Structures are given as C-alpha cells and as structure tokens.
Write a protein that binds this ligand. Structure first.
Ligand SMILES: O=C(O)CCc1nc(-c2ccccc2)c(-c2ccccc2)o1
Ligand SMILES: O=C(O)CCc1nc(-c2ccccc2)c(-c2ccccc2)o1
Lengths: 127, 127
C-alpha cells in the first residue's frame, strides 16, 4: 500500500498537520476528549455529521455508522486523510481488525496510532 | 532524537558522502535536477523504484508513495540514511510538516537542508 503510511501522532500533531494541509480528518463524535479539544481549539465550530471545514477540515461520524460504510464514504470523497485506524476502540475492534477494514481505503492516508511499537504491529496486521 | 542530525550539504556533497559511507540515500525521481545530476555522475545507472546500489546506494521513490509509507519502508530496511527532509516540496509540504513526518524515522540519519538558516528552522520544527 504505497498510498497509506503509519505514524504515531498525538491529537495536537494531527490537528496541526490537518490545519496546514487541509487534509480531511475523520473524527468520531462519541470520543469526548477529541470533540472537547476541537470545540476549544476552534471556538464556534458547529459539529455535525459529514464534512465540516472550520479550523481544520473534519469528517464527523457516529459509531452507528459501520466502519466499511464510513470507508465507502471516504473513498467517494476522494480526499487525502489524516486519521486514526477506523473502528479501533470506537466500534469495539482491536488494532488487527481495524487494520483489516483499512485495507479497503483507496484514498491516500496518514494513519496515527498510539506508540511507535503500535506502528510496527499495525503495519503487520495491515499487510 | 540523538540518532538524527541536521546539516547543510548540497547535492554533490551528499553524493560524495553517500558514495564513501554506503549510507542509503532516498531520491525522489520526480525531482528532475537531482535525477539528472545522478545520471551524470554515475553514468549507466539503471534508475528504478527501491534500492539501487550503483555508484552510491540509493532508494528511488515516486511522490505517489506517501511520506509516511516511505518512512515505514526506510525504517524496515534498517539502513543509516543521508537524506533531505522527506516530503518537503516533493509532496507539497513545507519544512515544518516535513519535519513532523521525519520524527517517525527510527534509523540513524543525516538530514541535509538547503542553507544553514534552514538547519535552525528544521531543528526547531523537529522538536
Ligand atoms: O442541529 C441539529 O439538528 C444536529 C446537530 C448535530 N450535532 C451533532 C453532534 C455535536 C457534538 C457531538 C456529537 C454530535 C451532530 C451529529 C454528529 C455526528 C453524527 C450525527 C450527528 O449533529
Ligand atoms: O525497467 C524497469 O524495470 C523499471 C523502469 C523504471 N524507470 C523509472 C524512472 C527512471 C527515471 C526517472 C524516473 C523513473 C522507474 C521508477 C522509479 C521510481 C518509482 C517508480 C518507477 O522505473
């Protein structure tokens, strides 16, 4: 997968990169720590489902949207992503099963995991 | 990041260092000026994707390979690098966002930027 690569970026690193590049950043609106950080960093943002371009360019989704449907949607949007592994924790998936879904991503993406060791493990599951 | 240091070496200085040390030197094949110099200094070289050991030890990549994927691959090769900031200009990244990706390099690397002033800026961004 030449179009996908894995780093270990905290939220501030992801947001800073997304701010500068305008890459699309998926965000699960049920993850309170991320939603709260976004609401504080970009005062006045009206978080809603779908694309919200305000401060950074977000794709807000609910965990009621199944991972494969989310990936289907993101593929159709045809935007480069900065993202965490989709479905990981939010949909009750472990890292390996999140990686299995991410194989269906056809858009370029930077995938951020928790630690440098998780980078190696995730890439192993992905391939 | 004790395994990475920043210098200001032009292309000929980078090639001379690579030729003697056999450190792996990533090269973006879309950067015509660099490719033409390599073909001139190392006549007969067969440029193709991946490791090419001819004159110097190169890793040729296309900008269709995402920056994080390239760093994943270079980390897996486990070779010491002589390199420019990956993604800078070639992937539409400024120096700061290139430096952000470079934080994921786990192999030792000498990073060459365009001027001594850029050494200061890059080191500030990297940390
Ligand atoms: O004003 C209206 O009618 C809707 C406004 C709205 N707020 C939210 C939100 C806002 C903050 C946190 C979590 C949810 C949503 C929403 C977002 C994702 C998926 C589905 C819905 O939609
Ligand atoms: O003959 C064969 O087997 C391969 C021929 C080849 N030439 C090139 C090249 C040669 C010069 C300039 C820019 C590209 C590539 C290539 C290099 C990097 C990434 C992808 C492809 O591949």
């Amino acid at each position: 997968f030449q179009h996908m690569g894995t780093v270990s970026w905290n939220l501030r690193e992801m947001l800073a990169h997304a701010e500068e590049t305008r890459k699309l950043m998926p965000v699960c609106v049920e993850t309170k720590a991320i939603v709260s950080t976004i609401q504080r960093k970009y005062k006045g943002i009206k978080i809603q489902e779908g694309v919200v371009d305000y401060g950074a360019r977000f794709y807000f989704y609910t965990s009621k949207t199944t991972v494969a449907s989310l990936i289907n949607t993101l593929n159709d949007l045809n935007e480069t992503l900065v993202t965490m592994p989709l479905g990981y924790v939010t949909h009750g998936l472990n890292l390996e099963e999140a990686a299995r879904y991410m194989r269906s991503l056809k858009v370029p993406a930077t995938v951020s995991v928790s630690s440098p060791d998780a980078v190696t493990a995730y890439n192993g599951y992905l391939t």
